[PDB]
Design an enzyme around this catalytic site. Structure first.
Site, short mmCIF file in Angstrom:
data_model
loop_
_atom_site.label_atom_id
_atom_site.label_comp_id
_atom_site.label_asym_id
_atom_site.label_seq_id
_atom_site.Cartn_x
_atom_site.Cartn_y
_atom_site.Cartn_z
N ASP A 35 -4.24 -5.31 9.03
CA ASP A 35 -5.06 -5.02 7.82
C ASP A 35 -4.17 -5.13 6.58
O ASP A 35 -4.68 -5.56 5.53
CB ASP A 35 -5.78 -3.67 7.91
CG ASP A 35 -4.85 -2.48 8.05
OD1 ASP A 35 -3.65 -2.69 8.26
OD2 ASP A 35 -5.35 -1.34 7.95
N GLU A 36 -2.89 -4.76 6.71
CA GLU A 36 -1.94 -4.87 5.57
C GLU A 36 -1.49 -6.33 5.43
O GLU A 36 -1.70 -7.10 6.38
CB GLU A 36 -0.75 -3.93 5.81
CG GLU A 36 -1.14 -2.57 6.34
CD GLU A 36 -1.29 -1.50 5.27
OE1 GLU A 36 -1.07 -0.31 5.60
OE2 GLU A 36 -1.63 -1.85 4.13
MG LIG Z 1 -4.03 -0.74 6.53
#
Ligand SMILES: [Mg+2]
Ligand SMILES: [Zn+2]
Ligand SMILES: [Zn+2]
Ligand SMILES: [Zn+2]
Lengths: 228, 67, 183, 150, 110, 765, 151, 146, 43
Positions: free
Chosen positions: E91-92
């Site tokens: 997600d990052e």
């Molecule tokens: Mg994240």
């Protein structure tokens, strides 16, 4: 130089992956200045300077003939011709099986003799032929390899991947005033507890200075103090 | 499931256009774009309301438990 | 741009092939001296070939060590189980024609040290049993089918094969496409 | 069964690894609007793009905009799909900017936004992580008898 | 050594006979090759393992970039060798690492 | 418009998916199990005898699932949705024919039910097989359900595809500061063992088996396997290369150092070290015990007096050791996809049913002994009342193993868990991606990222994006879109073919010339050598393209290790490629026109030799073109469609080649958690938890994959009007700004359905 | 080879052939035929097959009348329909340019050289008669032959 | 890129037919690896440099990278110009097959295409081999995250 | 070997010391999803 290195430093392990001994020299030259010290600290050399090894029999006598080549020992700048090769062979083959009288016929064709519930002479001579091109004739028996590096200058420092710091410091052509290893437990055994805490602090600061980790040096100093 | 009454973004009533869109596609067949434009769905939000609708209620009604 | 017929034959001839891995064919330019064969032994029902070759006595024998170690070692025994492999035909050419004789149980002969075996057993002296257990059990239980090595007779075999290929002749009918499935 | 209104903290994603919770729910008249009065259902931060490099999401926005304006469902197939230039041609031929950036007005000031806004349809999935099933708060209550702890 | 018998092709061994004769006696078979003034020798070559030059540094073969290191008040460095690793979650985004070429100061700009 | 081969060869993908679906590994495995493996188990365990009463036997004649001989129709099965609602098991009865003797010399058959078979959904035995959506509506089944799972006690359980290292193959591994070991995990039909093979010191090579006490010197074992010249030993394991001679010669000295050897002496040496056999047949403790030691040292069971096959196997084992000794990088990657096999639900259930049937037979014979131990009035009539009673254990264990995922196999003796998982019902894509999911072997030392990295060899076999997050990153894998898992083909029809094609049996070859020409290996076993390995491989590939041998049999040649390898075992992942011959593709769009018009289904492209399956190993021998425009006159195959390197779930992503790969992996994670439409019968379903979108929309930007997997029929999401801009300051860090009055009009509106189950249980009182 | 660790030349001690790992492949091809001394992967294989064809012609002519030479043939175990197989089966035609062909039936095939067997070979008749069992030596094998069906 | 590819090919043909100058610190085989990796790094850096220099005023990624709120010029160059070189374990993509990364390249190919160099940017889209190599690099990043 | 002894109670991540003595579950605590709020003071 990261999490594993921090783990080793704060574990105070007696064995580390890739120990390095930074040994500044005295002179500024490649030919016959740095190569001499490099040869002074090397792992093993009989296979390097043998060019062959024999497995010889006669009517009643046996020979293990090694024709040490002078050209390799000359270009590869080492100080050893016959006698110290012979004594290294004696000591190492005594540690292996035995050595009572190793001869040198002369002209660098050193011969090792074998003599005495049967065929054990043959087995021992086979083992000697195998274990012969693995003995150390030159260099400290604590160095995996020595390398000459350049610190972005005209200074050709050599740093060794070994486990002997006192030997390197007492080696001729090296300055023992400024010769540091990255093994904390080695610094402790050779230089003392204060040098050990200095080495801890510097090794940790180097480890997090190679990662953009801006930690105040006082935390590292406190870590070294609590460890030492 | 069943066509939403209003466009999510605009609030324009699109629930009265689903059947007319289907009959525009079937009877006297039109392209989807011209069928949408003929129904007054000018803005692309109201256009996607009808264009992307999956009529799942017809599939659900195949399992009618009160036959 | 020519033709060389090949004729099958020896439908009953049991022609074993001996593979002496111990000795090369051609040490030098000329072929190596063919050995002398004596005291040949073969076992029905288990297919073991035991071949004895006497050792030279004028050089390289170690006679005193031989007697002091193992009693009778005047010869060398090569034992090898003949292995049933199909599609092998030993052949010869007699009149610009290659005559094929099917091979029975090629044998891979390797040196054997029965004298060492006997010395070791005489030192040590002081249930369906299926699988390969039955193989060795049968081999060392039922044995002693003596053979007499009659070396020298080819011409009779050669004429019999020639008599077997000249008197018989046949043609083939099977389609090539059927053969690629017959493969 | 239990009907669920998308509330503050409910998670959404957009087929490109760009997930996030609802930070705020705003009135329609507070939303920016285009010349036709189209108001976004969702506003996503441009700051999620430069570091994640989901160019596929921008291409999806443009292809979906061209597809809704053209009446055809577009294709974003791997190593293929509908070419970006054809979608830009559709956008231009229908009066929109080739790059899918429209001049919007502020919903709260009414003035033109000084930058053109990337404006179009994006497929958004509502994920099973709703804050209604995550909100927990204990003051006192059940304790494990062995340890007398909560 | 590595010599084999002509009879049974087992490995030959040197055996001490009477009068200390070093014959090539064959275990497992009555084979004897004695040494009558003949030098049985085995010669195998060994590598030279020549000298090696200074290690130096091949930093010219690394990917620089256009970034000013935080230590711009000490040295005027506008370049940094870099490598990018996604040590962050899926997600990052990705994380980038840097090393100023003017001072050798490393830092991750994330 | 005329067909263009470049942009219309992709129709081979829908053609292939039509007859070989995404959930087809499970389906084919279960169909093969219930059609042939049941027969094999019944024939292996066909006759249970009793020590008492010799004039009496029990014979298992035939085995059938869910069908009797009374009528052509099958037995009425409770429909799977009724099983789901009623918390029971979707199972069919197992029938056998019994030849049990009567006391008055009477021979008779029967049709006896010995338990219930949990039936896979949409298998051959399922009622949903070839249902036309009207029968599906009547049976309350979604026509878009994958099938391929089991309903046990109302719970949908899927037997996940299992990764493991290939059995009966040599794997060479190196090490730093330890030495070199190379193993052969050999699995026979009844005993599994790892003939571990290690080096201890001084470059001395040893054989280390579990049964043997101490590692045996390699020369001892080589002499024990009939190879006893001791020059051919070094000829076999070193050939003519001087370096390997010196490396290996040390353990020739230790062969004579103890004492010089015959074959039988080394036999006795090895037999001395056998550990035990639970103290039965003690009178075999002689030189005869080494025979069983050698015959049960590997999968090359020797049933005669010739040991050349096992001897050469150990010799190549040693030779691989010696090459690894001379240099590393001669070891083989343990994470290579070609070195792994995929075991499937049918294989799992076959072995589990084998164990259950063995237990059933043992207990039935115990009951038979208890009945017939009585002295008098031992009536035979109705000897099957006990079997009527005892049929419950097969059903019970067979249900419990699937329900719990724990598989306690006594015969093979490992306890594995996590075989089955509850099918995911978060979304349609969640269920579909739970199928075609593969779990990798445990005990892997997860501290390293070895079996976590993406390998290039998984290209087109395993999805490059569908990997999980958190803890099982790279361990749980997913099948690529267009793949096939090979089945087991009998290797004796093709060993004969190899001999026909010029391969000389190892019994005709001498040791000195073995490393002069290429060797030919059949499933890892050196069966012979051949001249012209290139011509042999070409002939074999032609013979497979013409259908004379199974299209799943792989042949490839190795240059570094002089070896032609032929693989026939199942579990190998493979995918179809277009065959490129003489710089041209073989499809040339006349076949594409026929395919689109209706003739020439996908299988006919295999029958005409236009396409062929390639496993990971033949791809080493291949040279694939991605497209038609780069067909250079040295390429062997052509990609059918390169987007099939992504799985079913990763196919939901639009323009994934324009994204950073972690984003694609994260979407593979998120799409399974998206809320949408579950099934056409989702309102008939009563599940423990079910999220449903009120107004799902199909995506405006779709892919070929989503329409191939019918995701546009049950979409999970909505086409939001999106303005990419900074707004209100509440959208920093991934946070989203949602429109009130879009929510009011039903955007993102969903509902959750939760079931609570209570049973009114009767009690002993 | 490389450096060789230096009454009957066949009764002296035998050492294996040792070639350096560097030139192992070049020597291997040369000694594949040199060990005998009897009295790119497609073109190289075809040229080696042409060499095998010429050697086959040479040895076949050298075996035309000799009373001990043998040539072991490897024929496919399921031969074409015409073991109890009797009489002439076909021909070994010598095509132009030196290449060979074999017609075991109506089928045309090809013929190779086989593995080079660097050890002494011999064919022998086993006749175990109940009256007297005898093993008769017939001759020695001069080289193997493989006949392969072609499609 | 054609200039850089041609130099890599010339170095490849030299390493194949003969013997290039082995670097003092590293052995012969990885000398070519280091040389061509550095050449590809330089070409990526210069392509990114011209990309950034020609980038428009008011470019959103440029503004975000200049103010430091989000991203970097490396991210912008990967999105626009070129995704340079897929490095795993500190070096190029290793052999997933026998002396070969993928069966879509020739055997014993050390060309930049065959060992992880991605000529495309994220705007133009990745060809299937570049897609696989970038996936491998992203996956090893993900596993480091774990 | 699942027999939980007295030293099994004390040893482990979820044992006695590391699970209940220095580190435990607390009353008057909550946990939910976090959202942004710029109009909230940083403290
Ligand atoms: Mg994240
Ligand atoms: Zn609207
Ligand atoms: Zn001997
Ligand atoms: Zn700086």
């Amino acid at each position: 130089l990261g999490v594993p290195r921090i783990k080793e430093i704060i574990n105070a392990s007696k064995v580390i992956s890739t120990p390095i001994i930074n040994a500044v020299l005295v002179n500024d030259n490649d030919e016959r200045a740095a190569r001499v010290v490099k040869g002074r600290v090397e792992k093993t050399l009989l296979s390097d300077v043998a060019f062959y090894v024999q497995d010889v029999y006669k009517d009643n006598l046996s020979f293990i003939q090694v024709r040490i080549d002078l050209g390799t020992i000359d270009k590869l700048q080492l100080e050893l011709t016959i006698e110290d090769i012979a004594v290294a062979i004696t000591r190492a083959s005594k540690l292996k099986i035995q050595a009572s009288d190793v001869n040198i016929i002369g002209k660098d064709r050193i011969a090792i003799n074998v003599f005495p519930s049967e065929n054990d002479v043959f087995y021992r001579m086979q083992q000697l032929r195998r274990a012969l091109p693995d003995v150390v004739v030159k260099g400290l028996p604590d160095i995996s390899r020595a390398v000459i590096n350049i610190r972005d200058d005209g200074k050709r420092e050599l740093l060794v991947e070994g486990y002997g710091l006192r030997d390197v410091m007492c080696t001729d052509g090296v300055i023992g005033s400024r010769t540091t290893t990255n093994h904390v437990l080695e610094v402790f055994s050779v230089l003392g507890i204060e040098a050990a805490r200095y080495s801890i602090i510097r090794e940790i600061n180097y480890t997090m200075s190679n990662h953009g980790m801006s930690v105040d040096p006082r935390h590292i100093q406190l870590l070294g103090d609590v460890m030492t | 499931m069943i066509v939403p009454v209003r466009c999510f973004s605009c609030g324009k009533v699109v629930g009265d256009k689903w059947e007319s869109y289907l009959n525009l596609l079937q009877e006297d067949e039109l392209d989807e774009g011209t069928a949408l434009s003929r129904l007054g769905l000018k803005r692309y939000c109201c256009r996607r309301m009808i264009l992307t609708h999956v009529d799942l209620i017809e599939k659900f009604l195949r399992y009618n438990p009160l036959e | 741009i020519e033709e060389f017929p090949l004729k099958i034959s020896g439908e009953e001839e049991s022609l074993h092939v001996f593979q002496y891995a111990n000795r090369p064919r051609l040490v030098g330019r000329k072929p190596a001296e063919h050995p002398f064969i004596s005291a040949a032994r073969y076992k029905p029902k288990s297919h073991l070939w035991e071949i004895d070759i006497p050792l030279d006595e004028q050089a390289f024998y170690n006679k005193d060590k031989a007697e002091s170690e193992w009693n009778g070692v005047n010869v060398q025994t090569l034992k090898g189980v003949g292995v049933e492999n199909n599609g092998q035909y030993a052949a010869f050419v007699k009149d610009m024609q290659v005559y094929l004789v099917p091979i029975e149980r090629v044998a891979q002969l390797k040196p054997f040290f029965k004298y060492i075996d006997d010395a070791n057993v005489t030192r040590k002296q002081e249930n369906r049993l299926t699988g390969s257990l039955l193989a060795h059990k049968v081999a060392d239980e039922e044995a002693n089918i003596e053979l007499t090595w009659a070396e020298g007779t080819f011409e009779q075999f050669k004429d019999t094969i020639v008599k077997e290929a000249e008197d018989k002749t046949l043609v083939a009918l099977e389609k090539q496409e059927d053969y690629i499935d017959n493969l | 069964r239990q009907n669920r209104r998308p509330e503050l903290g409910d998670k959404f994603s957009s087929r490109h690894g760009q997930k996030g919770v609802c930070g705020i729910i705003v009135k329609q008249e507070d939303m920016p609007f285009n010349d036709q009065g189209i108001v976004p259902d969702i506003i996503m931060n441009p700051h999620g793009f430069p570091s994640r490099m989901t160019v596929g999401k921008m291409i999806e926005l443009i292809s979906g905009k061209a597809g809704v304006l053209n009446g055809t469902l577009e294709y974003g197939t791997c190593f293929g799909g509908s070419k970006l230039e054809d979608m830009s041609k559709i956008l231009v031929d229908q009066g929109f900017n080739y790059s899918g950036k429209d001049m919007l007005y502020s919903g709260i000031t009414g003035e033109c936004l000084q930058a053109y806004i990337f404006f179009g349809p994006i497929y958004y999935q509502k994920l099973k992580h709703m804050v209604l099933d995550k909100m927990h708060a204990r003051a006192r209550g059940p304790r494990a008898v062995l340890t007398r702890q909560p | 050594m590595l010599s084999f018998c002509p009879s049974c092709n087992n490995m030959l061994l040197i055996t001490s006979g009477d009068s200390g004769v070093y014959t090539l006696a064959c275990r497992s078979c009555p084979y004897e090759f004695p040494i009558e003034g003949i030098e049985i020798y085995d010669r195998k070559k060994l590598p030279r393992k020549e000298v090696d030059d200074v290690l130096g540094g091949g930093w010219d073969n690394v990917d620089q970039t256009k970034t000013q290191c935080p230590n711009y008040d000490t040295c005027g460095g506008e370049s940094a060798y870099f490598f990018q690793l996604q040590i962050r979650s899926a997600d990052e985004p990705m994380t980038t690492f840097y090393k100023c070429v003017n001072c050798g100061h490393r830092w991750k700009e994330n | 418009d005329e067909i263009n081969t470049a942009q219309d060869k992709w129709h081979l993908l829908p053609a292939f998916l039509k007859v070989k679906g995404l959930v087809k590994q499970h389906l084919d495995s279960f169909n093969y199990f219930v059609d042939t493996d049941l027969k094999k188990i019944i024939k292996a365990n066909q006759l249970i005898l009793s020590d008492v009463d010799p004039e009496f036997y029990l014979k298992y004649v035939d085995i059938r699932v869910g069908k009797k001989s009374s009528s052509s129709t099958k037995d009425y099965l409770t429909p799977p949705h009724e099983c789901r609602l009623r918390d029971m098991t979707y199972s069919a009865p197992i029938y056998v024919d019994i030849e049990y003797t009567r006391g008055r010399n009477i021979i008779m058959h029967k049709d006896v039910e010995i338990g219930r078979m949990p039936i896979m959904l949409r298998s051959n035995k399922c009622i949903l097989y070839d249902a036309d959506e009207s029968k599906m509506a009547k049976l309350n089944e979604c026509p878009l359900d994958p099938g391929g799972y089991f309903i046990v006690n109302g719970t949908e359980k899927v037997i996940l595809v299992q990764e493991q290292l290939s059995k009966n193959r040599i794997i060479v591994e190196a090490d730093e500061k330890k030495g070199i070991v190379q193993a052969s995990v050999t699995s026979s039909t009844h005993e599994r063992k790892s003939k571990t093979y290690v080096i201890t010191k001084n470059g001395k090579i040893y054989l280390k088996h579990n049964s043997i006490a101490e590692e045996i010197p390699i020369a001892i074992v080589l002499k024990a396997c009939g190879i006893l010249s001791d020059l051919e030993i070094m000829q076999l394991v070193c050939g003519n290369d001087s370096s390997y001679q010196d490396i290996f010669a040390v353990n020739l000295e230790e062969s004579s150092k103890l004492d010089i050897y015959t074959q039988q002496q080394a036999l006795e040496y090895i037999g001395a070290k056998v550990k035990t056999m639970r103290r039965q047949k003690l009178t075999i403790l002689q030189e005869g015990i080494e025979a069983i030691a050698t015959t049960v040292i590997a999968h090359l069971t020797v049933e005669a007096l010739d040991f050349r096959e096992k001897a050469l196997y150990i010799a190549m084992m040693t030779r691989r050791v010696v090459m690894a000794m001379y240099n590393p990088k001669m070891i083989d990657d343990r994470d290579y996809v070609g070195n792994k096999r995929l075991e499937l639900a049918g294989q799992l259930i076959s072995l589990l049913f084998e164990d259950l049937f063995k237990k059933f037979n043992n207990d039935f014979k115990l009951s038979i002994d208890k009945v017939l131990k009585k002295p008098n009035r031992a009536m035979e009539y109705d000897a099957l009342l006990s079997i009527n009673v005892h049929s419950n254990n097969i059903t019970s264990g067979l249900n419990r193993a699937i329900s719990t995922g724990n598989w306690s196999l006594k015969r093979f003796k490992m306890e594995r868990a996590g075989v089955t998982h509850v099918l995911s019902r978060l979304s349609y894509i969640s269920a579909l991606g739970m199928m075609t999911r593969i779990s990798s072997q445990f005990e892997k030392s997860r501290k390293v990222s070895g079996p976590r990295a993406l390998q290039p060899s998984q290209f087109g076999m395993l999805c490059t994006a569908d990997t999980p997050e958190g803890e099982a990153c790279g361990l749980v894998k997913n099948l690529a879109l267009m793949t096939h898992i090979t089945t087991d083909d009998e290797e004796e029809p093709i060993k004969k073919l190899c001999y026909v094609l010029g391969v000389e049996d190892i019994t005709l070859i001498d040791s000195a010339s073995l490393h002069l020409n290429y060797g030919v290996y059949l499933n890892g076993t050196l069966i012979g050598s051949i001249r012209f390995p290139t011509k042999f491989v070409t002939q074999f590939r032609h013979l497979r393209r013409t259908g004379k041998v199974s299209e799943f049999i792989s042949i490839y040649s190795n240059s570094h290790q002089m070896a032609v390898h032929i693989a026939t075992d199942g579990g190998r992942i493979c995918r179809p490629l277009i065959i490129v011959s003489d710089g041209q593709s073989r499809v040339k769009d006349i076949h594409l026109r026929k395919l689109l018009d209706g003739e020439l289904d996908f299988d006919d492209f295999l029958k005409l030799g236009l396409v062929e399956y390639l496993d990971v190993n033949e791809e080493n021998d291949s040279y694939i073109a991605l497209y038609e425009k780069d067909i250079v006159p040295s390429m062997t195959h052509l990609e059918i469609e390169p987007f099939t390197i992504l799985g079913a779930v990763a196919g939901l992503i639009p323009y994934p080649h324009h994204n950073q790969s972690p984003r694609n992996t994260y979407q593979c994670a998120m799409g399974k958690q998206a809320i949408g439409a579950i099934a056409y019968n989702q309102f008939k379903r009563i599940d423990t938890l079910l999220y449903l979108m009120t107004y799902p929309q199909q995506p405006m930007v779709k892919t070929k994959t989503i329409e191939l997997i019918d995701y546009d029929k049950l979409p999970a999401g909505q086409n939001a009007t999106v303005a990419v801009m900074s707004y209100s300051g509440y959208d920093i860090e991934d946070a989203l700004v949602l429109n009130k009055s879009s929510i009011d009009r039903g955007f993102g509106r969903c509902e959750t359905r939760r079931k609570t189950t209570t049973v009114l249980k009767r009690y002993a009182n | 080879x490389x450096x060789x660790x230096x009454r009957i030349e066949q009764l002296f001690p035998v050492r294996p052939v040792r070639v350096r790992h560097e030139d192992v492949e070049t020597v291997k091809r040369e000694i594949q035929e040199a060990l005998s001394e009897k009295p790119k992967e497609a073109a190289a294989e075809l040229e080696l097959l042409n060499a095998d064809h010429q050697h086959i012609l040479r040895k076949l002519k050298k075996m035309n009348n000799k009373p001990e030479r043998f040539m072991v043939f490897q024929l496919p175990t399921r031969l074409p329909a015409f073991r109890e197989l009797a009489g002439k089966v076909g021909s070994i035609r010598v095509h132009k340019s030196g290449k060979l062909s074999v017609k075991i039936g109506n089928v045309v095939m090809d013929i190779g050289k086989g593995a080079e067997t660097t050890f002494l070979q011999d064919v022998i008749a086993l006749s175990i008669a109940d009256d007297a069992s005898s093993a008769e030596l017939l001759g020695r094998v001069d080289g193997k032959i493989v006949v392969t069906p072609q499609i | 890129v054609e200039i850089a590819y041609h130099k890599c090919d010339e170095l490849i043909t030299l390493f194949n037919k003969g013997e290039l100058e082995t670097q003092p610190g590293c052995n012969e085989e990885q000398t070519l690896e280091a040389k061509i990796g550095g050449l590809l790094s330089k070409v990526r850096e210069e392509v990114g440099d011209v990309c950034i220099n020609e980038l428009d005023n008011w470019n959103a990624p440029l503004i975000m990278a200049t103010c430091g709120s989000k991203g970097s010029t490396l991210n912008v160059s990967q999105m626009v110009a070129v995704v340079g070189q897929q490095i795993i374990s500190g070096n190029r993509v290793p052999d997933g097959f026998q002396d070969r990364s993928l069966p879509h390249f020739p055997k014993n190919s050390k060309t930049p295409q065959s060992k992880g160099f991605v000529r495309n940017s994220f705007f133009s889209g990745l060809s299937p081999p570049e897609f696989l190599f970038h996936a491998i690099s992203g996956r090893e990043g993900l596993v480091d995250t774990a | 070997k699942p027999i939980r002894g007295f030293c099994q109670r004390l040893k482990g991540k979820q044992g006695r010391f590391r699970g209940n003595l220095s580190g435990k579950r607390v009353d008057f605590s909550g946990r939910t999803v976090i959202s942004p709020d710029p109009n909230l003071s940083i403290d």
